[PDB]
Protein backbone atom coordinates (compact mmCIF):
# COMPACT_ATOMS: atom_id res chain seq x y z
CA UNK A 1 0.00 0.00 0.00
CA UNK A 2 2.92 2.35 0.73
CA UNK A 3 6.64 2.38 0.12
CA UNK A 4 9.19 0.84 2.46
CA UNK A 5 10.98 4.13 3.17
CA UNK A 6 9.96 7.72 3.78
CA UNK A 7 11.61 11.13 3.76
CA UNK A 8 10.80 13.21 6.84
CA UNK A 9 11.55 16.91 7.32
CA UNK A 10 12.71 17.87 10.82
CA UNK A 11 12.28 21.57 11.62
CA UNK A 12 14.17 22.98 14.59
CA UNK A 13 13.60 25.86 16.97
CA UNK A 14 15.56 28.19 14.67
CA UNK A 15 13.55 27.12 11.55
CA UNK A 16 16.46 25.20 10.01
CA UNK A 17 15.70 21.79 8.49
CA UNK A 18 17.35 18.37 8.35
CA UNK A 19 15.72 15.64 6.27
CA UNK A 20 15.87 11.94 7.11
CA UNK A 21 15.40 8.86 4.97
CA UNK A 22 13.78 6.38 7.37
CA UNK A 23 12.41 2.89 6.99
CA UNK A 24 8.70 2.82 7.82
CA UNK A 25 9.31 0.35 10.66
CA UNK A 26 12.29 2.08 12.30
CA UNK A 27 11.79 3.33 15.85
CA UNK A 28 11.91 7.11 15.84
CA UNK A 29 14.36 7.15 18.76
CA UNK A 30 16.95 6.62 16.03
CA UNK A 31 15.95 9.91 14.40
CA UNK A 32 16.02 11.71 17.75
CA UNK A 33 19.54 10.44 18.42
CA UNK A 34 20.85 11.45 14.99
CA UNK A 35 19.24 14.88 15.08
CA UNK A 36 20.58 15.66 18.56
CA UNK A 37 24.07 14.53 17.48
CA UNK A 38 24.02 16.88 14.47
CA UNK A 39 22.88 19.80 16.65
CA UNK A 40 25.45 18.99 19.33
CA UNK A 41 22.94 18.97 22.19
CA UNK A 42 21.72 16.27 24.57
CA UNK A 43 18.86 14.24 23.15
CA UNK A 44 17.06 14.67 26.50
CA UNK A 45 16.99 18.45 25.98
CA UNK A 46 14.65 18.10 22.99
CA UNK A 47 11.10 17.04 22.32
CA UNK A 48 9.94 15.87 18.92
CA UNK A 49 6.36 16.42 17.74
CA UNK A 50 4.30 15.10 14.85
CA UNK A 51 0.98 16.87 14.28
CA UNK A 52 1.43 18.40 17.71
CA UNK A 53 1.79 15.08 19.54
CA UNK A 54 4.92 13.85 21.26
CA UNK A 55 6.78 11.16 19.31
CA UNK A 56 7.61 8.22 21.56
CA UNK A 57 10.95 6.43 21.21
CA UNK A 58 9.28 3.26 19.94
CA UNK A 59 6.85 5.02 17.60
CA UNK A 60 7.42 4.22 13.93
CA UNK A 61 6.41 6.20 10.82
CA UNK A 62 4.04 3.36 9.94
CA UNK A 63 2.35 3.43 13.35
CA UNK A 64 1.95 7.23 13.29
CA UNK A 65 0.62 7.28 9.73
CA UNK A 66 3.48 9.44 8.50
CA UNK A 67 3.70 10.18 4.80
CA UNK A 68 6.39 11.42 2.43
CA UNK A 69 7.79 14.83 3.42
CA UNK A 70 5.76 15.09 6.61
CA UNK A 71 7.11 17.52 9.20
CA UNK A 72 8.52 16.69 12.61
CA UNK A 73 8.92 19.74 14.85
CA UNK A 74 11.65 20.00 17.48
CA UNK A 75 11.11 22.11 20.60
CA UNK A 76 13.12 22.50 23.77
CA UNK A 77 12.02 19.98 26.40
CA UNK B 1 22.33 23.39 1.18
CA UNK B 2 19.86 20.51 1.38
CA UNK B 3 20.63 18.01 4.13
CA UNK B 4 19.40 14.40 3.84
CA UNK B 5 20.61 11.77 6.32
CA UNK B 6 20.09 8.05 5.78
CA UNK B 7 18.98 6.31 9.00
CA UNK B 8 19.51 2.61 9.49
User: Which CATH number goes with the domain that contains A64?
Assistant: 3.10.20.90
In total, how many domains does chain A have? 1
Please state how this structure was obtained.
X-ray
For residues B5 and A20, the answer to whether their CB atoms sit within 8 Å is yes
**In A, which residues are within 8 Å of B3 by CB distance?**
17-19
CA dist A41 and A60 (Å) reads: 23
Q: Is residue A14 less than 8 Å (CB to CB) from chain B?
A: no
SS in 3 state form for A20-69? Answer: EEEECCCCCHHHHHHHHHHHCCCHHHEEEEECCEECCCCCCHHHHCCCCC
**Owning domain of residue A22:** 5-76
Distances (CA, A) of A67 to A1, A5, A62, A72: 12, 10, 9, 11
Please tell me the distance from the alpha carbon of residue A4 to that of residue A22, in angstroms, as a whole number.
9
Q: Are A57 and A29 in contact (CB under 8 A)?
A: yes
**Shortest CA distance to B7 belongs to which of A35, A74, A17?**
A35
* DSSP count for chain B of H helices, then E strands: 0, 1
Alpha-carbon distances, residue A52 vs A5, A23, B4 (angstroms)? 23, 22, 23
Task: For residue A25, give the chain B residue with the closest CA.
Answer: B8
Amino acid sequence: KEGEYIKLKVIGQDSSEIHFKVKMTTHLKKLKESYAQRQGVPMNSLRFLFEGQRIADNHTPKELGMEEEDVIEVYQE
Amino acid sequence: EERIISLD
